[PDB]
Amino acid sequence: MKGDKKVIQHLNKILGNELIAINQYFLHSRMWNDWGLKRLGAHEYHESIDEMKHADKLIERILFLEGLPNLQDLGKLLIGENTQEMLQSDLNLELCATKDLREAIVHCEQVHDYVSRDLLKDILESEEEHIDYLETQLGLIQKVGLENYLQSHMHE
Amino acid sequence: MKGDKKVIQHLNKILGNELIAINQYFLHSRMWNDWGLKRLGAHEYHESIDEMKHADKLIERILFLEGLPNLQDLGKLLIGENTQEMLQSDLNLELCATKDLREAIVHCEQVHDYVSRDLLKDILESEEEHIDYLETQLGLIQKVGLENYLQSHMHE
Amino acid sequence: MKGDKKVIQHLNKILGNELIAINQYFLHSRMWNDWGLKRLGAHEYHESIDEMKHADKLIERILFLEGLPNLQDLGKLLIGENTQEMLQSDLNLELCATKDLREAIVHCEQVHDYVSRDLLKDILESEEEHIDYLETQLGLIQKVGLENYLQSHMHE
Amino acid sequence: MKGDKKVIQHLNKILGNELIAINQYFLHSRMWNDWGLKRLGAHEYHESIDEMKHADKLIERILFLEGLPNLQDLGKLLIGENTQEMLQSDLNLELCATKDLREAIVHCEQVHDYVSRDLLKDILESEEEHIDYLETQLGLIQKVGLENYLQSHMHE
Amino acid sequence: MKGDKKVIQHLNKILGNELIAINQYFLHSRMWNDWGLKRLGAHEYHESIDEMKHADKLIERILFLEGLPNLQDLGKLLIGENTQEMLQSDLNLELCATKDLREAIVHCEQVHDYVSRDLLKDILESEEEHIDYLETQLGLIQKVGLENYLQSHMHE
Amino acid sequence: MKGDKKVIQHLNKILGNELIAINQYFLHSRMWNDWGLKRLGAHEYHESIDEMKHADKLIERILFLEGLPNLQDLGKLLIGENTQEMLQSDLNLELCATKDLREAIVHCEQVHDYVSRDLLKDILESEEEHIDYLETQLGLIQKVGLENYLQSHMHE
Amino acid sequence: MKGDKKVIQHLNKILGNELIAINQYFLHSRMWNDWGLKRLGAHEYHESIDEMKHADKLIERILFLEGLPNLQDLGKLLIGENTQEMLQSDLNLELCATKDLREAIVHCEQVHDYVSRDLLKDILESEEEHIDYLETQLGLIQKVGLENYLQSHMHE
Ligand code: HEM
Ligand code: HEM
Ligand code: HEM
Ligand SMILES: [Fe+2]
Ligand SMILES: [Fe+2]
Ligand SMILES: [Fe+2]
Ligand SMILES: [Fe+2]
Ligand SMILES: [Fe+2]
Ligand SMILES: [Fe+2]
Ligand SMILES: [Fe+2]
Ligand SMILES: [Fe+2]
Ligand SMILES: [Fe+2]
Ligand SMILES: [Fe+2]
Ligand SMILES: [Fe+2]
Ligand SMILES: [Fe+2]
Ligand SMILES: [Fe+2]
Ligand SMILES: [Fe+2]
Ligand SMILES: [Fe+2]
Ligand SMILES: [Fe+2]
Ligand SMILES: [Fe+2]
Ligand SMILES: [Fe+2]
Ligand SMILES: [Fe+2]
Ligand SMILES: [Fe+2]
Ligand SMILES: [Fe+2]
Ligand SMILES: [Fe+2]
Ligand SMILES: [Fe+2]
Ligand SMILES: [Fe+2]
Ligand SMILES: [Fe+2]
Ligand SMILES: [Fe+2]
Ligand SMILES: [Fe+2]
Ligand SMILES: [Fe+2]
Ligand SMILES: [Fe+2]
Ligand SMILES: [Fe+2]
Ligand SMILES: [Fe+2]
Ligand SMILES: [Fe+2]
Ligand SMILES: [Fe+2]
Ligand SMILES: [Fe+2]
Ligand SMILES: [Fe+2]
Ligand SMILES: [Fe+2]
Ligand SMILES: [Fe+2]
Ligand SMILES: [Fe+2]
Ligand SMILES: [Fe+2]
Ligand SMILES: [Fe+2]
Ligand SMILES: [Fe+2]
Ligand SMILES: [Fe+2]
Ligand SMILES: [Fe+2]
Ligand SMILES: [Fe+2]
Ligand SMILES: [Fe+2]
Ligand SMILES: [Fe+2]
Ligand SMILES: [Fe+2]
Ligand SMILES: [Fe+2]
Ligand SMILES: [Fe+2]
Ligand SMILES: [Fe+2]
Ligand SMILES: [Fe+2]
Ligand SMILES: [Fe+2]
Ligand SMILES: [Fe+2]
Ligand SMILES: [Fe+2]
Ligand SMILES: [Fe+2]
Ligand SMILES: [Fe+2]
Ligand SMILES: [Fe+2]
Ligand SMILES: [Fe+2]
Ligand SMILES: [Fe+2]
Ligand SMILES: [Fe+2]
Ligand SMILES: [Fe+2]
Ligand SMILES: [Fe+2]
Ligand SMILES: [Fe+2]
Ligand SMILES: [Fe+2]
Ligand SMILES: [K+]
């Protein structure tokens, strides 16, 4: 089925965001694991897997619409040097991603691509859960202190 | 994540409706049970539990959006004195609730809060099922007669 | 069997205290969950459920005695802004509520409503366990430190 | 142990009431069964078994207190001729029984026989459940009509 | 079905004997239990249950024959003060009961109420088993001595 | 938040009685076991465990009320030299315990400490069971003779 | 056939030490439980049970040797006011106990009561495990800090 070219362009923009998030989260996960903060590593890995699944659904939708998925362009990773920086960088990336998702949903509604809208809404629900996770961890660092927070995320 | 203040105000309005419905339905349930109309009591209890779960989701969403859930303000319960009045009072309350849900959905769409919209749509689907249940019971009272209808709802 | 009018007034007063506690504890529970303090959130949810069950038993007893349960009047919630304030606010509520239970039991005894007395005694046993829980947590904060206490109530 | 002679007199009065209820409810049960109203018959049999178990506990307590259980004196049975009369006669009997139970509890409290008081309170809780059952059935006859009420209690 | 009025009178006489035996044996059972003679108490309870089941069948038959079961008139209980007296009092009661059963069977045969006769014969077989039990226990007291007999019926 | 000072004194008095009974019954148990009267020894051990559990509940209650449990003061043990004396000494001790329990319950009721009252009533129910056990054993010695009574309590 | 009088005196001295430890550790256990330090409370309860089992074995041995177990004389409990004092007071008590055990073993060896010696050696092995437990906890307080130590012993 021949999709709207601007919808396909929006879907490729979302896909591009997923690709940044996959790599940033995977590396953050393996950094936490390397440091012996295995619970943080495992949860960051789970976030990376979520983004892999979002990318998959986007690729499948673009192909159905007769578009060309762009897996070539990888935007800027902002890798942190410590736990607080890593969490904040992830959170900043998620906030950029939801902004793009909302603009893509607007466009899908405008051209009556309600199935793409619903896919993007499902991804946006997941991203807001990611934002909730990351905001909550930064808040816990303040409430229990950094050393305790890290201690609680050492052992799986 | 910092939510739109008018969306949060709409969510608290919906929450307020849930709180009325929880108490009205719980008391109606226990009145039917007290009268020995246990099947009616059990179904009304189920409705009250549905509204408890709606309230829960609304509270969680308001907190995520950095709003303050209002569990203090309880609107007017209209407790019936017999089965027909109790069902009709519930139905009137549901019809008020769906009106508020539609206005809240309009606002979420306007400001691109698509995750809150989808939550409210899910609640609205449940409320229309509640309306269907209550309308159907009032119709059955007409078709089988009040005495038979009550008889059929005595024993679980 | 018509119950004593002042006994029914007392039961409605106890019921009113339960309705305050249901909402305050439910909101405190969801606040703790929102902050990622899930062990605190779960325990507070089970306190809320306990009060819901108290309210149910009182409603059933009032109806049996041919009184009108009052679910319309909701007294003042006191929502804390951090863990210490939330625990202290719950403790304030419980201490005020047990004072009313004792006065209600006195009245039941005076008019020989021994079944209502035993119901209120069972609720009072639960409220003193709730007081014990709350006082103990506040004491643990003093013994292990606030940051450690919150750490220990982060993960379920 | 040597019980208070007036307490033993109260316990024998309660036992006397149980013996009336056992026989009245057993006969009402078998009359309902005879008429093909088997659900009514089964519930009335259950009430009769409850009173047998009350009598057993009272006999045991009287003997422990070195009293003589009185199973010789059987008071007045009032056997109804139709369902409404039978239920109302049972209800009248239960209301007489609770009046005697409250006077007995007063006396146990006066002489500090707290264990006998707790037994009598357990019996009283059961009789108030019996009263609730009987009142509820009389109310259902009004709400669903006598013919429907009987129909619903034909088949087990 | 319309029973013979003299047969119904006989059945009510048998029922009257059952009602005496129920109460006498239940009290003897609880006296033996009170004394710590639990095997004697359990067997006497079993005898009491047998008489309850006899009474039930007689009530059912009387009602089928369109008679009025008489549970109002309770004849003389003869409660013993020690084991030998209790057993002998039960035995005396059983011998009175079989005398009445034989006269009732004669009358059933005379008027061709063969189904009532067979019920009464089944009851009589049970009473002769009861007589055998009681006679045997009195004989064992002579053969093993009273102290040994009681010792053997202390523990269940 | 403290209990009533005189209630705490009563609870410590009850606790003192438990501590006497624990030690007296444990030694009596082990004397019976040493003599080869293992069924008596096992039952007496069970009585001692009951008193340990009573003491535990009292200690927990005193601490909740912010009293100081007194485990220092051990009153007079009266150890018997043979089975009859041991049983009688236990019985005398239980009768002193129930006297103190009734005085403590009066006080709890007076100051509206209804949870302490219910705890003491539960302990009192258990002590009256203990009295029943002891009185019954002494009575069995009379009915079956001492040698037979001891014989029946040799083997478990 | 009697044990040595001075061996029996030593065994009663060891028994006296057990009785102190039972009560001291049981109260310390219930204080820790009351404070919400349930893992400390559970371990201390376990220590108290060990001492109850030691006392049982000593009572059995004394009775076999035809001595009189002394459960009347309770020496001085030293109840701590906080975790460090409670642990230290337990440790001081264990060190007194092992001193008396070694003197008792010397005496058993001197008079060739090798079975009493082996029993006391088994108790001594257990007391040195108790000492190891207590010393290790005090050392952990130093290594992890008091607040962390207490935190780690809050939850079971
Ligand atoms: C009149 C006030 C209320 C009464 C008497 C009441 C009663 C109950 C009862 C009896 C249950 C079942 C508990 C059990 O058996 O475990 C229940 C479930 C529940 N209630 Fe309430 N309730 C009240 C109000 C509320 C409110 C105001 C909220 C939240 C804002 C709430 C949240 C819940 C939740 C989340 C459940 C669990 C439902 C499930 O099974 O998923 N309730 N309620
Ligand atoms: C002093 C009066 C009586 C006492 C204390 C007494 C006591 C009892 C008790 C304790 C049970 C066992 C109930 C249970 O544990 O579920 C029982 C069973 C029963 N009783 Fe009675 N009873 C009395 C008189 C009667 C009478 C007068 C009747 C009928 C006319 C009757 C009919 C029955 C029947 C049919 C059962 C069930 C037996 C079975 O099949 O297991 N009882 N009774
Ligand atoms: C302050 C006084 C005491 C208290 C509060 C106390 C408490 C307890 C409790 C709660 C139990 C567990 C019972 C159960 O749950 O079944 C127990 C077990 C036991 N107690 Fe005590 N106790 C006390 C004194 C004693 C004394 C003085 C002795 C012996 C001289 C003793 C001997 C025993 C024995 C043999 C057990 C069973 C241990 C096992 O499980 O193998 N107790 N105690
Ligand atoms: Fe590694
Ligand atoms: Fe997830
Ligand atoms: Fe994503
Ligand atoms: Fe295709
Ligand atoms: Fe666009
Ligand atoms: Fe979808
Ligand atoms: Fe994401
Ligand atoms: Fe590790
Ligand atoms: Fe592990
Ligand atoms: Fe009811
Ligand atoms: Fe549903
Ligand atoms: Fe709802
Ligand atoms: Fe948040
Ligand atoms: Fe709006
Ligand atoms: Fe959704
Ligand atoms: Fe609804
Ligand atoms: Fe029914
Ligand atoms: Fe059913
Ligand atoms: Fe969350
Ligand atoms: Fe609980
Ligand atoms: Fe409550
Ligand atoms: Fe009612
Ligand atoms: Fe009052
Ligand atoms: Fe109760
Ligand atoms: Fe509470
Ligand atoms: Fe404090
Ligand atoms: Fe975590
Ligand atoms: Fe987990
Ligand atoms: Fe029939
Ligand atoms: Fe029942
Ligand atoms: Fe009864
Ligand atoms: Fe007795
Ligand atoms: Fe009286
Ligand atoms: Fe009780
Ligand atoms: Fe009753
Ligand atoms: Fe049928
Ligand atoms: Fe059936
Ligand atoms: Fe007994
Ligand atoms: Fe049999
Ligand atoms: Fe019979
Ligand atoms: Fe018939
Ligand atoms: Fe005849
Ligand atoms: Fe037959
Ligand atoms: Fe018989
Ligand atoms: Fe025994
Ligand atoms: Fe047995
Ligand atoms: Fe032995
Ligand atoms: Fe027991
Ligand atoms: Fe006790
Ligand atoms: Fe406390
Ligand atoms: Fe006092
Ligand atoms: Fe209780
Ligand atoms: Fe006791
Ligand atoms: Fe043997
Ligand atoms: Fe054996
Ligand atoms: Fe506690
Ligand atoms: Fe151990
Ligand atoms: Fe020891
Ligand atoms: Fe010996
Ligand atoms: Fe020595
Ligand atoms: Fe050994
Ligand atoms: Fe030790
Ligand atoms: Fe905790
Ligand atoms: Fe746990
Ligand atoms: K820590």
Structure method: X-ray
**The token pair that represents G81 in the structure block:** 């006011």
CA distances from residue G116 to F32, F109, G14, G122, G127 in whole angstroms, order as listed: 21, 52, 12, 10, 16
Which amino acid type is present at position F49?
I
What residues of D are in contact with residue C4 (Cβ under 8 Å)? none
Q: Which ligand is closest in space to the CA of residue B156?
A: 21
- Token pair, residue B120, equals 């409210």
For ligand 3, whether the C-beta of G55 sits within 6 Å is yes
Query: Considering only CA atoms, which of A69, A68, A96, A88 is closest in space to residue A28?
Result: A88
Residue of F nearest to D116 (CA): F125
CB contact under 8 A, D77 and E72: yes
3-state SS, residue C133 = helix
**Would an 8 Å CB–CB cutoff place C142 in contact with chain B?**
no
The CA distance from A107 to B11, in Å, is: 26
Give residue D114's identity as a one-letter amino acid code: Y
State whether F34 and G71 contact (CB < 8 Å): no
Q: Do B33 and C69 touch (CB under 8 A)?
A: no
Q: For ligand 2, what atom is nearest to the CA of residue E59?
A: 30
- Chain D contact for B144 (CB, 8 A cutoff): no
Residues of F in contact with D105 (CB under 8 A): none
Question: Any idea what DSSP says for residue C81?
Answer: S
* Pairwise CB contact (< 8 Å): C1 & D128: yes
How far apart are alpha carbons G26 and G32 in whole angstroms?
Answer: 10
**Residue of A128, A131, A136 best to disrupt the B interface, most CBs of B under 10 A:** A128
Q: Taken in order B9, B15, B21, B26, is the CA torsion positive or negative?
A: negative
Instruction: Say if F and A touch: at least 3 Cβ pairs within 8 Å.
Output: no
- Whether B34 lines ligand 1, by a CB cut-off of 6 Å, is no
Q: Alpha carbon of D92 to those of C9, C66, D21, D149: distances in Å?
A: 27, 18, 11, 21
d(CA C137, CA B41): 39
Is B81 annotated to bind a ligand? Reply is no
CB A48 within 8 A of CB A22: yes
Cβ of D20 less than 6 Å from ligand 2: no
DSSP letters along F62-126, please?
A: HHHTT-----S--------SSHHHHHHHHHHHHHHHHHHHHHHHHHHHHTT-HHHHHHHHHHHHH
Find chain F residues with C-beta within 8 A of D115's C-beta: 121, 124-125, 128
C22 lines ligand 1 (CB under 6 A): yes
Neighbours of G68 (CB within 10 A): 12
| C78 reaches D (C-beta below 8 A) | no
Is there a binding annotation on residue D156?
A: no
Q: Name the phi and psi angles at A33, rounded to 5.
A: -60, -45
Asked whether the beta carbons of F33 and F147 are under 8 A apart, the reply is no
C127 is in an annotated binding site: yes
F121 vs D1, D64, D114: nearest CB:
D114
* Contact between residue C148 and residue A148 where contact means Cβ atoms under 8 Å apart: yes
Instruction: Supply the DSSP symbol for A81.
Output: S
User: What's the token pair of residue C151?
Assistant: 């750490």
Q: Which of C68, C57, C72, C49 shows the shortest CA–CA distance to C116?
A: C57
Burial class of G20 by CB neighbour count within 10 A (0 to 12, 13 to 18, 19+) = buried
D129 touches chain B (CB under 8 A): no
What is d(CA D27, CA D46) in angstroms, rounded to the nearest whole number? Answer: 12
Q: Domains (ranges, CATH) in chain E?
A: 1-156 (1.20.1260.10)
Q: Give the ligand 2 atom nearest the CA of E55.
A: 30
Please tell me if residue F99 touches chain C, with a CB cutoff of 8 Å.
no
Q: G touches which chains (3+ CB pairs under 8 A)? A: C, F
A102 to B115: CB separation less than 8 angstroms, yes or no: no
How far off is chain F from C38, nearest CA to CA, in Å? Answer: 27
Q: What are residue A88's phi and psi, to 5 degrees?
A: -65, -40
Distance D139 CA to ligand 3 centre (A): 55
Fill in the amino acid letter for B123. I
CA distance D101 to D14: 7
Question: In whole angstroms, what is the distance from residue B106 CA to residue A114 CA?
Answer: 17
Q: Annotation-wise, does C155 bind a ligand?
A: no
Directed axis angle between helix G83-110 and helix G38-64, to 10°? 20
Give yes or no for C2 touching D (CB within 8 A).
Answer: no
Please, is G51 exposed, middle or buried when counting C-beta atoms within 10 Å of its C-beta (0-12, 13-18, 19+)? buried
